[PDB]
Design a binder for this molecule. Sequence first.
Ligand code: GTP
Ligand code: CL
Ligand code: CL
Ligand code: CL
Ligand code: CL
Ligand code: CL
Ligand code: CL
Ligand code: CL
Ligand code: CL
Ligand code: CL
Ligand code: CL
Ligand code: CL
Ligand code: CL
Ligand code: MG
Lengths: 209, 996, 119
Amino acid sequence: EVQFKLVLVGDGGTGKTTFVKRHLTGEFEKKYVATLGVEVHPLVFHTNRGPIKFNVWDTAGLEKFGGLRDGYYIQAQCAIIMFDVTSRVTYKNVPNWHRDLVRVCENIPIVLCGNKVDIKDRKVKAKSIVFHRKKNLQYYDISAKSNYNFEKPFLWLARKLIGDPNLEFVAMPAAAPPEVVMDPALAAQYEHDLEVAQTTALPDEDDDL
Amino acid sequence: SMEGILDFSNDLDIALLDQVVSTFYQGEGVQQKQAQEILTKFQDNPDAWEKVDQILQFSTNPQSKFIALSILDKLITRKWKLLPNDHRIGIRNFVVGMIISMCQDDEVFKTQKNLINKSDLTLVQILKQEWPQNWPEFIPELIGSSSSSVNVCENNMIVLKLLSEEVFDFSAEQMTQAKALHLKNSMSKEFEQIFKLCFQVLEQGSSSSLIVATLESLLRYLHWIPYRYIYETNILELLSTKFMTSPDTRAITLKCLTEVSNLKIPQDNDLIKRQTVLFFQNTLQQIATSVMPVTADLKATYANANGNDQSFLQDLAMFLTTYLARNRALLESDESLRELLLNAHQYLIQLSKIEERELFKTTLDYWHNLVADLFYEPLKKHIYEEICSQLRLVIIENMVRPEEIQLYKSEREVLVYLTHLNVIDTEEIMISKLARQIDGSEWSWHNINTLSWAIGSISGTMSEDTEKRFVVTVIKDLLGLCEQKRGKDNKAVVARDIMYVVGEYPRFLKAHWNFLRTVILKLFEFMHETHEGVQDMACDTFIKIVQKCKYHFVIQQPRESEPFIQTIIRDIQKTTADLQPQQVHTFYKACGIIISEERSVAERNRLLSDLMQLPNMAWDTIVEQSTANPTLLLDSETVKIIANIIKTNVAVCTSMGADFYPQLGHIYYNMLQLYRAVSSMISTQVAAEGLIATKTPKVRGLRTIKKEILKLVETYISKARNLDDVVKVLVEPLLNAVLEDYMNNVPDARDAEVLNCMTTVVEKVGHMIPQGVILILQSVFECTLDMINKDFTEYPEHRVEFYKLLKVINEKSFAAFLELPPAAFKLFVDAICWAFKHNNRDVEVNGLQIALDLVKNIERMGNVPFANEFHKNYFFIFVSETFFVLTDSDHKSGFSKQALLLMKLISLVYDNKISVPLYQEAEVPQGTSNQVYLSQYLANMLSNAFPHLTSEQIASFLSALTKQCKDLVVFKGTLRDFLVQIKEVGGDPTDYLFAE
Amino acid sequence: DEEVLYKVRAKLFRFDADAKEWKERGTGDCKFLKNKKTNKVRILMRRDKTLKICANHIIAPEYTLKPNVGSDRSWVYACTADIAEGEAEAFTFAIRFGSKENADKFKEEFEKAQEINKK
Ligand SMILES: Nc1nc2c(ncn2[C@@H]2O[C@H](COP(=O)(O)OP(=O)(O)OP(=O)(O)O)[C@@H](O)[C@H]2O)c(=O)[nH]1
Ligand SMILES: [Cl-]
Ligand SMILES: [Cl-]
Ligand SMILES: [Cl-]
Ligand SMILES: [Cl-]
Ligand SMILES: [Cl-]
Ligand SMILES: [Cl-]
Ligand SMILES: [Cl-]
Ligand SMILES: [Cl-]
Ligand SMILES: [Cl-]
Ligand SMILES: [Cl-]
Ligand SMILES: [Cl-]
Ligand SMILES: [Cl-]
Ligand SMILES: [Mg+2]
């Protein structure tokens, strides 16, 4: 297992924390709770070349919650720059995030990600997105909500950091799960907990799943 | 213990800071997290800057010193001008001294690049503040200190690179226009001496790290310096030969030559043209001899991803496309330059084969430029024949599906141009690729799909005769392919592609009725195939063919007994029997397209009658049972049937618009009774089961009925031609059925689709129903506002539809707002300002537009009491609310419309277009002009909101603003200058005198 | 080492009692796998693209599939021991499918698997 420091940067509400949380737990957080300074989470993928661990430094996009700002970028080995394709200002700000990042990290693989491509009224058109070309950034359209291309930023960075272009995500063998006996002392405990959960609606009942 | 550094009453323990920082950067979990919070509180302490010089002197952690410089940078950029001159000179000296010291120690220079670069940026922040007016000798001393040491010279190149970026590349948003111009003129005035130094280092050579830093600074200079520094020195030769040969300098040099290719250059000068040719010749010669020949497999190289190969090949693509899009005409008329021209294009052909979507798009943009040129420019296509032949194959093998709209558009346009240039070569490549599908050598689902999309994309480029032969050959071959293939997966893939191709050649279908009939009847057969994707592609192909060939379905074709639309309708039950509801609706939508071609009213109404036969008979029986027994609606199966009848009506109304009226008229009464009956059931369910009821499948089903009814009425009214019938037949029953139901439901049961329907009604017939618009406001205004005025998040759909409704009422029926009681009108002004404060761009933009339109609505009323009372009550609320969202840095997307609103408000007073005093009496002399009072009010408001500004800054700003209130671009300039100045202390009040 | 008895596309949620909300855990192929040594049938579910495990538990005979108030194409059930995220934990799960038909078929197969597991 090798570990790499990954810095995630971009304007407030572009979907940085939502994207990371989806990768960590599988969940989709609908609410906007602005990151304060930085949130650090280990994230592990299983590849045909063994496990790879990203130490993910999810930084604050809002100026008032910026904390150490470029202080977070020190010794980063890779980066994602995030914008919102429903918000033109967030793409206008991509050169500013890139500037602040590369002044600290001169020679690292960087992915530019246009998030929220699931939303019908797209404001930053494909034709407009060219900033990555002269800066040698990889670019992906992503949706943390629909999971469109949600694995690509990490698959591309893993290939760059391992120096293997043929690297793939793989399924690890699944251990036989334990047989257990329901605890007769916690049986009344569980009918309660199940009552609450049966009578709370599942989210997004209109989706394909 | 870590929290010790936050205690400022005691001197700072550097060894503790160093541990906190180490904990943050190298620690984990709970410890990392806590160190993080402590460091942020330390940095944000407004006296923390005092500790910087101590930390820089006595810390052993380079991360501590980095964070110290961040703290210093906050002071320099925000509060520098508060410092006595002696203190500013002190800070300047301890920064310069730290930089020189670090550079003179070879070990530290090698290993502490982070801290040196951060120090260099800090120095540049001081230069932005101090230079040149309070530091005239900076550049001479930098040039002087550069000969003392290779490390200092190299670091000086990093400083000049960052200075150039800060002054020319990033100044627009970060400085006043006046300050940006001052620093640009200042660097321009001293550049001669900077360039001399850069050229000497490049000529004298030796240290690769120094040369690379120097070319990195040159890349920045090329954004702004005059061409003569490049064309009237040896630098073009050095860049295009020496620096292309060594791989350390090759990547930066290529980037420089790309920017050289974009210089502003004289057009009528043969020596400059020859120099432009020569640097290209030299660069391509160095690549062919030192990197790879023209024949090299760049697809393979890129895939292998060795070292910096990917970045180099991207940079080569950028250089070739940039240079050729500007200069290829220089290479086209001279026989001696033919080989250079075709080798450069041959490199682009090889780069275009790289498996990398974003690189492909870059090269495709160039190819589009070129083939568009060859289509129009005389005597040029013959040059590029072999390049274009290769490119035909690259585009055909790379064709994406039409769902990827921008990429498919680009690819189609290139392939269309190429097909015009050589139809025979395009045909030969497509037929031979089809042959390799049939012989199995290149067979795969992706490969037959790709080819089908390419064949589809050139429809309409060939002559009708050539198209005919081509289409027949392709369908014959794809049919052979289908038969040949085994198992349903393979057969489905080829069947879908046959359908796809046929659907893209309407000109062929329109000439061959017998073939078109066969296609349709075959599509009807496929609508019974349950194999995944077949029914969807059959329905998609049907509606696509109808959109294009609808006229051929509505006439009687020779040797047919009736128009084919009659034949479709007659067998509709059987045709659609195996389809999912959404597929059935597409089928009926397609029949609607055809029927709308019939312009004989009697015949059209009869076709519509016959098409709607099955949903109308299903409806009639349900309505009989629904009226007979109200309990029957509760049944899940009935709700799904009713929803699907309404959806069928929406589908046919979508394609028939105004023509759909007789069908709407047939169901209208009982549809609105159903709306009321379903509404009762929802209310009843929510009472019995609680708010959770709204999540249940039953209540979602019932709400679906209401939403589809609202959708059907908005669909019809948005396209209606006879507005008299809309107002006289549809509107009264609609308003009676929906408005009171919306008002008297609990928030969670209210449909945002009601607001959307009402928006279309006011849009189309608002002028004709003044009492209806009043009733709409009374029913939806205050109850919807109360749902959305507690936070920015709840009821997002209601939020959006609410401001769209207010916007159209304010445009079309402003009298409805005059009829409001004063309390209700005050809530309307509250609602508009509330919209201003939103970050969802939909609401904010409607908010600011309503404000504009309302001002215009009031101004129209002329000198009357309502207008006079409006200004007295609300002028200052709008001015201050607009200033609030302009300045709080939380509403930057709204900048343009905020400025437009502020300009209109200020211009009303500057023009004396407000009849009464805006001040209440004995607040100023009773003679006082509104202009004097507005000036006073704004000076006071800005002074309290921004107490760090001087009286001089505020007065200068407001003087400029009122003078520029007829010139939006200049006004916006002044506003942006103000937004820069409020982020710092001691902004120059003369900045507001700026003129371009 | 396992026979695939049933495969269906599904979205899996776990109930967060603290936040009193359903949190999605993964979307992908839900598989009923019969261990060829023990004849024990488990649910193994992998996320699309990452192929990371979001469900790994025995289909215990004592488990009961219940409706969710919001859905006609979902089941909720208490799981005493799931090993998807390492160490065995108890979860309240909800699994949602493309159709009521898919959910009913799942239920049918889940009961069959419960009977196989009774042996
Ligand atoms: N429709 C849609 N919404 C998304 C998507 N990704 C995130 N969101 C939502 O948009 C918001 C993003 O919030 P965050 O992920 O906290 O944003 P952030 O960039 O981390 O914000 P800061 O911490 O302020 O820098 C939340 O409301 C998300 O639920 C997406 O792909 N599609
Ligand atoms: Cl992980
Ligand atoms: Cl793009
Ligand atoms: Cl690229
Ligand atoms: Cl200049
Ligand atoms: Cl040209
Ligand atoms: Cl026609
Ligand atoms: Cl019949
Ligand atoms: Cl129907
Ligand atoms: Cl009222
Ligand atoms: Cl309010
Ligand atoms: Cl203000
Ligand atoms: Cl300030
Ligand atoms: Mg965040």
